Design a protein around this ligand. Structure first.
Ligand SMILES: O=C(N[C@H](CO)[C@H](O)c1ccc([N+](=O)[O-])cc1)C(Cl)Cl
Length: 123
């Protein structure tokens, strides 16, 4: 099983990116999925999550109104649309999958982690 992030890059402040997390080896349609980030010299932090259940999403306060998480089960892919990017959004972004299917919104150590994609937002 592998999660692979793509869609990172270097963008002017105020611009947008769309990150993709493509899963292989297993359908994750029954699993909640999440995006996290780690800025240089800082700890990993939650960005957004999307349930297996239609329409249920969660966002860190710092990205509310700017980022949107979505998923496409036919492509086995989760997306992070990132609008109104700020220099403080510069980080490696990681996608992850819940440790169990059909989970609630309580904290669990994610069961699978990707290797990350770099996002750099210029001045
Ligand atoms: O983001 C995730 N887990 C967070 C960690 O804070 C939390 O455990 C969670 C799990 C499920 C969920 N959901 O079903 O929408 C939301 C958050 C995993 Cl889905 Cl990768």
């Amino acid at each position: 099983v592998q999660l692979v992030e793509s869609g990172g890059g270097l963008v002017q402040a105020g611009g947008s990116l769309r990150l993709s997390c493509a899963a292989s080896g297993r359908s994750f349609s029954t699993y909640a999925m999440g995006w996290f980030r780690q800025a240089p010299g800082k700890e990993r932090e939650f960005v957004a999550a999307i349930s297996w259940s239609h329409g249920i999403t969660y966002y860190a306060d710092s990205v509310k109104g700017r980022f949107t998480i979505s998923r496409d089960n036919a492509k086995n892919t989760v997306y992070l649309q990132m609008n109104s990017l700020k220099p403080e959004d510069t980080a490696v972004y990681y996608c992850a999958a819940d440790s169990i299917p059909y989970g609630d919104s309580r904290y669990r150590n994610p069961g699978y982690w990707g290797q990350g994609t770099q996002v750099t937002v210029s001045s």
